[PDB]
């Protein structure tokens, strides 16, 4: 908005602009291990206790 | 750095920034709104002024 | 395209003066700066000339073709009201002064400051301690006519000095003083001194007659010498059966076209540029007229 | 690709022919005269025209694979273009 | 219990309805009932438009102003095609062939010809021999000094459709400047900072401010060789010439040895000419040249009309 001005100057002009922002991006990584034994006996089937 | 003759007055001006208030008592003065007008400005190539 | 002035007053009309506005309505007067608000002061022309001061007119000009020029349209009790003089504009106008000059119907206006007489195209209002001072707008042969007056003046005036009083009544105030019109004739107000800014239009004068007078002609010398003397005519009248002698020495030798024709074309050259030098005035031409209302519409 | 020039006496920066139609030293000739040799002679013709003639071969070219600026051709002087005579 | 406030919005949407002007009566001639119904109003209209009989019939109640356009063709040589659109551009008179090139003529193609800026001009122009080639009598005419006499302003330029040898142009002649391609949108005119006195400042009651601020254009022969320099000034026709005159003087007395005393035919020291006018109390922007090797300051200005006077001599 703006205000009207009685003085001898031009009047002002009503303002509306353009703003553009830009959006960041964020990346996240975690590493996590697994034994070679941890992820073998999966394939298995047990039935003893 | 020695002395002159005479002696001498220095003269500055100093401006201030200030904050001020401002007491008005009821019904000081009467105020009469007209009718607002329009007219037109310029006709632009491009666009209308008012 | 549309341009309306409101000059604001800070005191009041003092009605003793509004009469005279009013009479005063819908003459040309000069103002400060093109804005929607205006000072009293920059209003009139009462900046460029005042009261005390020995008036010089050449800086009169200068101020009045740099200002824009303005209608006077309505004077109100705290406002004057004002449309301007935009340059692609057609506009009626009307006029009175009191050196009353009478127009033509096509005749170019010109826009002077006002010589004759401060109390006629000035009205004081002491009310805000000013004075408007309206400009003089004549026919353009009364302006170039009154306008050379002035700077042979303000040369004479110069030249007058140490001479016999014979020279002080004379020159001074025989065709420097008065302007004739139709069974009609108007006294000038003079500059008691030689003013400066006024020479400054000489000094370019001079300049242009240094370099002109080295490339006149030769034949026009010889066709004047032998008319002169041979026959009678009416603009050979000032010169009488005498010649000035100068024109016998210059004569002396023979004729060529060749050399007359390059001398022609920089003398066609060097005379456009004189309208300059002359003019300094915004001249406004008339489209139509009424005598009967005394209201022409100027452009 | 043996020899270099036909006669010397033309083909070089100030040569005789060069002088005489050359853009160089032809200030005081009378304007509105055409001269045949003056599209052959003419130093910066000739750059205009090869330069015009690779940009036309280059742009065609390293095209169709940004702002195309459209290129108006003709064929009235294709001896001009082409700098032969038949 | 809203106030309703101070000033009301029906009066404003009213009173701006009505200063609306009408729309413009587009005609559809591929289908044939639209065509026919457009006729019809075009019939109305000229019968509402022209009977004194009746008052609504008198429709006058409440400016053209594009420019001329002049269409010049030119020479790819003679013409960057890079150069900023709106340059005041300058012409030249070709003697019998004319159809060929116009060989109209840029402010720097003049300071190339004429002999920072410098090295600009020559990024621009590396063998400027051509333009030794549009005027031949070049040698000839700086001592003739008729090299203003053909050199004709032009203004501004709108448009060049680029071609191979020759360039067409668009070219503002009279009124304000302005385009063609849309609802025409404007442009401005640039002129080199350097190379450029402003003489409102050159001598600096009060002052009067006009509205209306000229260009104005001057051609000078000095011993080192002719130049041209543009003026932005406000005053008159009567008070430039003056002032420019004072300006010069400095360089006037120079020419004593120059001048031959027998031939007056090379004295003149300048022409002065009125191009357009602009708005005053604004000033003018700044900014360069965004080419190859830009590194020319180059004033700039808004509103211009362009109004281009003739060459008055001055000495």
């Given at each position: 908005?703006?205000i009207?001005?009685?003085?001898?100057?031009?009047?002002?002009?009503?303002?509306?602009?353009?703003?553009?922002?830009?959006?960041?991006?964020?990346?996240?990584?975690?590493?996590?291990?697994?034994?070679?034994?941890?992820?073998?006996?999966?394939?298995?089937?047990?039935?003893?206790? | 750095?020695?002395?002159?003759?005479?002696?001498?007055?220095?003269?500055?001006?100093?401006?201030?920034?200030?904050?001020?208030?401002?007491?008005?008592?009821?019904?000081?003065?009467?105020?009469?709104?007209?009718?607002?007008?329009?007219?037109?400005?310029?006709?632009?190539?491009?666009?209308?002024?008012? | 395209?549309?341009?309306?002035?409101?000059?604001?007053?800070?005191?009041?009309?003092?009605?003793?003066?509004?009469?005279?506005?009013?009479?005063?309505?819908?003459?040309?007067?000069?103002?400060?700066?093109?804005?929607?608000?205006?000072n009293?002061?920059?209003?009139?022309?009462?900046?460029?000339?005042?009261?005390?001061?020995?008036?010089?007119?050449?800086?009169?000009?200068?101020?009045?073709?740099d200002?824009?020029?303005?209608?006077?349209?309505?004077?109100?009790?705290?406002?004057?009201?004002?449309?301007?003089?935009?340059?692609?504009?057609?506009?009626?106008?009307?006029?009175?002064?009191?050196?009353?000059?009478?127009?033509?119907?096509?005749?170019?206006?010109?826009?002077?400051?006002?010589?004759?007489?401060?109390?006629?195209?000035?009205?004081?209002?002491?009310?805000?301690?000013?004075?408007?001072?309206?400009?003089?707008?004549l026919?353009?042969?009364?302006?170039?006519?009154?306008?050379?007056?002035?700077?042979?003046?303000?040369?004479?005036?110069?030249?007058?000095?140490?001479?016999?009083?014979?020279?002080?009544?004379?020159?001074?105030?025989?065709?420097?003083?008065?302007?004739?019109?139709?069974?009609?004739?108007?006294?000038?107000?003079?500059?008691?001194?030689?003013?400066?800014?006024?020479?400054?239009?000489?000094?370019?004068?001079?300049?242009?007659?240094?370099?002109?007078?080295?490339?006149?002609?030769?034949?026009?010398?010889?066709?004047v010498?032998?008319?002169?003397?041979?026959?009678?005519?009416?603009?050979?009248?000032?010169?009488?059966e005498?010649?000035?002698?100068?024109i016998?020495?210059?004569?002396?030798?023979?004729?060529?076209?060749?050399?007359?024709?390059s001398?022609?074309?920089?003398?066609?050259?060097?005379?456009?540029?004189?309208?300059?030098?002359?003019?300094?005035?915004?001249?406004?031409?008339?489209?139509?007229?009424?005598?009967?209302?005394?209201?022409?519409?100027?452009? | 690709?043996?020899?270099?020039?036909?006669?010397?006496?033309?083909?070089?920066?100030?040569?005789?022919?060069?002088?005489?139609?050359?853009?160089?030293?032809?200030?005081?000739?009378?304007?509105?005269?055409?001269?045949?040799?003056?599209?052959?002679?003419?130093?910066?013709?000739?750059?205009?025209?090869n330069?015009?003639?690779?940009?036309?071969?280059?742009?065609?070219?390293?095209?169709?694979?940004?702002?195309?600026?459209?290129?108006?051709?003709?064929?009235?002087?294709?001896?001009?273009?082409?700098?032969?005579?038949? | 219990?809203?106030?309703?406030?101070?000033?009301?919005?029906?009066?404003?949407?009213?009173?701006?309805?009505?200063?609306?002007?009408?729309?413009?009566?587009?005609?559809?001639?591929?289908?044939?009932?639209?065509?026919?119904?457009?006729?019809?109003?075009?019939?109305?209209?000229?019968?509402?438009?022209?009977?004194?009989?009746?008052?609504?019939?008198?429709?006058?109640?409440?400016?053209?102003?594009?420019?001329?356009?002049?269409?010049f063709?030119?020479?790819?040589?003679?013409?960057?095609?890079?150069?900023?659109?709106?340059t005041?551009?300058?012409?030249?008179?070709?003697?019998?062939?004319?159809?060929?090139?116009?060989?109209?003529?840029?402010?720097?193609?003049?300071?190339?010809?004429?002999?920072?800026?410098?090295?600009?001009?020559?990024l621009?122009?590396?063998?400027?021999?051509?333009?030794?080639?549009?005027?031949?009598?070049?040698?000839?005419?700086?001592?003739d000094?008729?090299?203003?006499?053909?050199?004709?302003?032009?203004?501004?330029?709108?448009?060049?459709?680029?071609?191979?040898?020759?360039?067409?142009?668009?070219?503002?002649?009279?009124?304000?400047?302005?385009?063609?391609?849309?609802?025409?949108?404007?442009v401005?005119?640039?002129?080199?900072?350097?190379?450029?006195?402003?003489?409102?400042?050159?001598?600096?009651?009060?002052?009067?401010?006009?509205?209306?601020?000229?260009?104005?254009?001057a051609?000078?022969?000095?011993?080192?060789?002719?130049?041209?320099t543009?003026?932005?000034?406000?005053?008159?026709?009567?008070?430039?010439?003056?002032?420019?005159?004072?300006?010069?003087?400095?360089?006037?007395?120079?020419?004593?040895?120059?001048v031959?005393?027998?031939?007056?035919?090379?004295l003149?020291?300048?022409?002065?000419?009125?191009?357009?006018?602009?708005?005053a109390?604004?000033?003018?922007?700044?900014?360069?040249?965004?080419?190859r090797?830009?590194?020319?300051?180059?004033?700039?200005?808004?509103?211009?009309?362009?109004?281009?006077?003739?060459?008055?001599?001055?000495?």
């Amino acid at each position: 908005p703006t205000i009207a001005h009685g003085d001898g100057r031009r009047p002002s002009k009503q303002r509306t602009f353009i703003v553009v922002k830009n959006c960041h991006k964020h990346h996240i990584s975690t590493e996590m291990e697994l034994s070679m034994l941890d992820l073998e006996i999966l394939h298995s089937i047990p039935e003893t206790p | 750095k020695i002395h002159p003759g005479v002696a001498m007055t220095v003269v500055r001006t100093d401006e201030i920034l200030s904050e001020n208030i401002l007491f008005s008592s009821r019904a000081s003065t009467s105020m009469f709104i007209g009718t607002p007008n329009v007219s037109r400005r310029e006709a632009r190539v491009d666009a209308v002024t008012f | 395209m549309d341009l309306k002035v409101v000059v604001s007053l800070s005191s009041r009309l003092y009605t003793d003066e509004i009469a005279k506005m009013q009479q005063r309505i819908g003459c040309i007067l000069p103002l400060a700066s093109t804005h929607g608000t205006q000072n009293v002061q920059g209003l009139g022309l009462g900046q460029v000339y005042s009261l005390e001061t020995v008036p010089d007119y050449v800086s009169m000009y200068n101020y009045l073709s740099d200002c824009t020029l303005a209608v006077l349209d309505e004077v109100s009790v705290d406002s004057l009201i004002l449309t301007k003089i935009v340059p692609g504009q057609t506009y009626a106008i009307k006029n009175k002064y009191q050196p009353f000059f009478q127009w033509h119907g096509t005749g170019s206006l010109s826009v002077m400051p006002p010589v004759f007489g401060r109390e006629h195209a000035t009205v004081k209002l002491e009310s805000n301690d000013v004075d408007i001072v309206f400009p003089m707008v004549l026919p353009t042969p009364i302006a170039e006519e009154v306008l050379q007056k002035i700077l042979l003046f303000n040369v004479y005036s110069r030249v007058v000095m140490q001479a016999p009083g014979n020279a002080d009544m004379l020159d001074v105030h025989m065709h420097l003083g008065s302007v004739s019109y139709l069974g009609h004739h108007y006294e000038l107000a003079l500059p008691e001194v030689p003013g400066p800014l006024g020479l400054a239009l000489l000094d370019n004068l001079s300049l242009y007659f240094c370099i002109m007078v080295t490339l006149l002609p030769r034949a026009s010398m010889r066709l004047v010498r032998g008319l002169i003397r041979h026959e009678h005519h009416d603009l050979l009248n000032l010169f009488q059966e005498m010649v000035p002698d100068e024109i016998a020495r210059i004569d002396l030798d023979d004729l060529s076209v060749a050399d007359d024709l390059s001398r022609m074309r920089v003398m066609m050259t060097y005379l456009q540029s004189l309208a300059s030098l002359f003019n300094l005035g915004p001249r406004l031409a008339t489209a139509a007229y009424s005598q009967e209302t005394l209201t022409a519409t100027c452009w | 690709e043996y020899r270099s020039t036909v006669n010397p006496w033309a083909s070089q920066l100030g040569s005789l022919g060069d002088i005489m139609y050359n853009s160089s030293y032809r200030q005081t000739a009378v304007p509105g005269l055409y001269s045949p040799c003056r599209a052959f002679f003419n130093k910066e013709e000739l750059l205009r025209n090869n330069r015009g003639l690779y940009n036309m071969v280059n742009e065609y070219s390293q095209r169709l694979g940004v702002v195309i600026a459209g290129t108006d051709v003709f064929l009235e002087q294709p001896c001009s273009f082409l700098q032969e005579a038949f | 219990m809203k106030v309703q406030g101070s000033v009301d919005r029906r009066r404003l949407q009213r009173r701006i309805a009505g200063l609306l002007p009408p729309p413009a009566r587009r005609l559809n001639i591929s289908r044939g009932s639209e065509f026919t119904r457009d006729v019809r109003g075009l019939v109305e209209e000229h019968a509402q438009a022209s009977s004194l009989s009746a008052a609504a019939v008198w429709r006058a109640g409440l400016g053209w102003r594009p420019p001329v356009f002049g269409d010049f063709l030119i020479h790819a040589s003679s013409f960057n095609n890079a150069e900023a659109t709106g340059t005041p551009l300058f012409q030249f008179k070709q003697s019998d062939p004319f159809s060929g090139v116009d060989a109209v003529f840029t402010p720097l193609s003049l300071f190339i010809l004429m002999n920072g800026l410098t090295r600009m001009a020559n990024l621009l122009y590396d063998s400027p021999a051509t333009l030794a080639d549009l005027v031949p009598d070049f040698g000839r005419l700086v001592a003739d000094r008729r090299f203003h006499n053909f050199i004709t302003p032009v203004g501004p330029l709108v448009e060049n459709i680029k071609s191979t040898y020759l360039n067409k142009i668009t070219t503002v002649v009279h009124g304000p400047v302005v385009s063609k391609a849309i609802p025409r949108s404007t442009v401005k005119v640039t002129v080199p900072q350097e190379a450029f006195v402003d003489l409102d400042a050159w001598l600096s009651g009060l002052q009067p401010c006009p509205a209306d601020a000229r260009l104005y254009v001057a051609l000078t022969y000095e011993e080192a060789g002719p130049r041209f320099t543009f003026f932005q000034s406000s005053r008159g026709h009567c008070q430039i010439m003056n002032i420019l005159r004072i300006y010069y003087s400095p360089s006037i007395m120079h020419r004593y040895a120059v001048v031959q005393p027998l031939h007056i035919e090379e004295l003149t020291f300048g022409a002065v000419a009125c191009l357009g006018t602009f708005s005053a109390t604004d000033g003018w922007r700044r900014s360069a040249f965004n080419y190859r090797g830009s590194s020319l300051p180059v004033v700039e200005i808004d509103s211009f009309y362009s109004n281009v006077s003739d060459w008055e001599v001055i000495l």
